[PDB]
Amino acid sequence: MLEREKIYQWINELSSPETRENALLELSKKRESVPDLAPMLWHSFGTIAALLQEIVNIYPSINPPTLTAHQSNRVCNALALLQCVASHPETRSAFLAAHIPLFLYPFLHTVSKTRPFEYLRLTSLGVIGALVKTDEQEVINFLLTTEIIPLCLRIMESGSELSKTVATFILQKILLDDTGLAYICQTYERFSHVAMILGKMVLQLSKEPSARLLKHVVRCYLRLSDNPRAREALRQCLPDQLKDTTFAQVLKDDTTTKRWLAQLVKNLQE
Amino acid sequence: DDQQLDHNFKQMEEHLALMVEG
């Protein structure tokens, strides 16, 4: 009972800027303990507009990169609430129709390696991640037309171990869709851009390993082998580190990733 | 505040770590 009242109060407190900051903090942490939080956020008057205001207010501090720890903490609570709106089945289609991801694209364009920026990009990726996990064709077709693949690949190449995992995960969920695989493999340009980054990643992974990032890079390579045009291209460009005993030690524990790489090499044979 | 940033980052890290898991 009392628990819900506290939540309803905070949702209503998001509407006035005088209480918005604290209401963001309290709700962003109670986020996982409240299952129906997303439709409560969605069907409360001017709650989404308040969340989007928190995003647009931070735009002048993005470029030039003058975003502070406090500024980042505040916007990342708002982005966390959008993350859960993106996840929920009742609100996901409505969130996409409201083009909410387009507000995060400036954040994903940032390169500043400061923690306020690290957190901003990671939380923003988490929103796209939440949207893709739902394995919805409509999400995929949105993402394909909005040029997220370039933004992901930039992060995938030169981001934090985890933000790289999250961006690779977003690429993976696109590639898993038939239309997504068809799109990336449609032109040599598109495929070559993806494969080059994926390969570059295998090389950094062979130096500084990440058993979770390798799991997603392997799944990406394996999914590309489903397209014959990509399979033939991969017969030439596949990193030698995936063919030999490089990752054999780190994959002693991961029997699933071990299976994927075993299937990939078999798929490439013929 | 900067001490809280590192915490909130670590929390997001752990959160997204479970999201990518399949």
Curated annotation (Swiss-Prot), chain A:
Tissue expression summary: Detected in spleen, thymus, prostate, testis, ovary and intestine.
UniProt entry tagged with the keyword Nucleus: yes
The keyword Flavoprotein appears for this protein: no
Main localisation: nucleus
Phenotype upon changing residue 212 to E: Loss of DNA binding
Gene3D superfamilies, per database record: Leucine-rich Repeat Variant
Recorded GO CC terms: CCR4-NOT complex; CCR4-NOT core complex; cytosol; membrane; nucleus; P-body; protein-containing complex
Annotated localization: Nucleus; Cytoplasm, P-body
Keywords from the named record: Acetylation, Activator, Cytoplasm, Nucleus, Repressor, RNA-mediated gene silencing, Transcription, Transcription regulation, Translation regulation
GO terms (BP aspect): cytokine-mediated signaling pathway; negative regulation of intracellular estrogen receptor signaling pathway; negative regulation of translation; nuclear-transcribed mRNA poly(A) tail shortening; positive regulation of epidermal growth factor receptor signaling pathway; positive regulation of peptidyl-serine phosphorylation; regulatory ncRNA-mediated gene silencing; sex differentiation
Molecular function per GO: epidermal growth factor receptor binding; kinase binding; protein domain specific binding; protein homodimerization activity; transcription coactivator activity
Family: Belongs to the CNOT9 family.
Assembly mode: Homodimer. Component of the CCR4-NOT complex; distinct complexes seem to exist that differ in the participation of probably mutually exclusive catalytic subunits. Interacts with MYB, ATF2, RARA, RARB, RARG, RXRA, RXRB and RXRG. Identified in a complex with ATF2 bound to target DNA. Interacts with NANOS2. Directly interacts with ZNF335.
Function: Component of the CCR4-NOT complex which is one of the major cellular mRNA deadenylases and is linked to various cellular processes including bulk mRNA degradation, miRNA-mediated repression, translational repression during translational initiation and general transcription regulation. Additional complex functions may be a consequence of its influence on mRNA expression. Involved in down-regulation of MYB- and JUN-dependent transcription. May play a role in cell differentiation.
UniProt name for this protein: CCR4-NOT transcription complex subunit 9
Lineage, uppermost ranks: Eukaryota, Metazoa, Chordata, Craniata, Vertebrata
Gene from which this protein is expressed: CNOT9
From Swiss-Prot, chain B:
Coiled coil: none
Cell location: Cytoplasm
Disruption of the gene: reported phenotype: Viable, but males and females are sterile. Flies exhibit abnormal cysts containing an excess number of cells undergoing transit amplification, which do not differentiate into gametes. Conditional RNAi-mediated knockdown in intestinal cells reduces adult lifespan due to severe age-dependent dysfunction of the intestinal barrier.
The record's account of how the chain is modified after translation: Ubiquitinated (C-terminal region).
Induction conditions: Induced by Traf6, possibly in response to activation of the IMD immune signaling pathway. Expression levels increase with age, possibly in response to inflammation induced activation of the IMD pathway.
Function: Regulatory component of a deubiquitinase complex consisting of bam and otu. The complex deubiquitinates K63-linked polyubiquitinated proteins, antagonizing the ubiquitination activity of Traf6 and regulating the IMD immune signaling pathway. Otu-bam deubiquitinase activity is regulated by Traf6 dependent immune signaling regulation of bam expression levels; this forms a feedback loop that regulates the IMD immune signaling pathway and balances gut immune activity during aging. The complex deubiquitinates and stabilizes CycA/cyclin-A to regulate CycA-dependent differentiation.
Notes concerning its domains: May possess a C-terminal PEST sequence (rich in Pro, Glu, Ser and Thr) targeting it for degradation and rapid protein turnover.
Descriptive protein name: Protein bag of marbles
Organism from which the protein derives: Drosophila melanogaster (Fruit fly)
Parent-protein start and end of this portion: 13 to 34 of 442
